[PDB]
């Protein structure tokens, strides 16, 4: 199991190696699926790459 | 944030529930965002559609 | 340029078609490129594999 | 409904604005989805990293 | 590394597993990794969710 | 047929290339499509946004 994570720009090193983590945990225990071979995979962009109902996330 | 999330095929789906909660906790955790922000996307296949190693997952 | 569109099923191949059409003209004209060269690709799912904050939109 | 865009870098900050605007648009109008629960995610790319039948864009 | 290849609905099983196979040697010698550690998704999807130039492929 | 590739940094723009090139040989070869139509996207991203089995590629 793989997961692509698409997160705005702007996180600590640690706090994207806790999500790494913490992500691959929550994978592996709900799949059933050996921790050793979860793949996390984080894509990050700008505030104003996301848009909410027809606007930049960055207003 | 936003999880995509790449399966097997061959879970329940309450098992899928428990893959969008447990991930999405988790994201909003390691974030400290707020988990009413975050969105999961499930993109199942077959397990010949896997591959790992030059090698259908369905061995 | 690409788009790929993350949709529930439920819609019907002549919606699919509009889609297609109408996000395809609305990035050929905001990024002026020739409407010929757009591809778009619709990834649909069951509604139970999309989690909004926790929920599966089914919920 | 979530969109994905794969656009190569070169667009300011108004022009990508726009994208979002009008993708969003339609994609509310065409699968009959409240405008607010469109979601759309840049993701851009140097000129180098599209390959058109075996060669970057690029050239 | 892994490689994510969208294709229209239709190929046979044996194909696929072709398909998997090739790539996957294709990634380990252009980026000098081990064949072990190329993961291979297929996302399959129905040739009218294909659009090209505004136009679903199907025609 | 569409390929996105997903790496690391730190190739060079010439390896790039031959990733392009050899990565559309095989999906041309083993789906026999016209090599002309085949489409390559890479997705590069840091040595940290990459999770094997809970920890950061850059461990």
């Known amino acids: 199991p793989i997961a ?3 997160i705005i720009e702007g996180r600590t ?5 806790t ?8 994978m592996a225990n709900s799949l059933d699926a050996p921790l050793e071979r979860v793949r996390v995979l ?5 505030k104003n790459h996301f848009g909410i109902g ?6």
Chains 1, 2, 3, 4, 5, 6 share one sequence.
Not at 13 to 17: A, G, L, N
Not at 42 to 46: C, Q, R, S
Not at 54 to 59: I, M
């Open 4 to 6: 692509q994570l698409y």
């Open 13 to 17: 090193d640690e706090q994207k190696e």
């Open 54 to 59: 027809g606007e930049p996330a960055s207003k």
């Open 19 to 26: 999500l790494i983590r913490q992500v691959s945990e929550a």
């Open 42 to 46: 984080i894509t990050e962009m700008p």
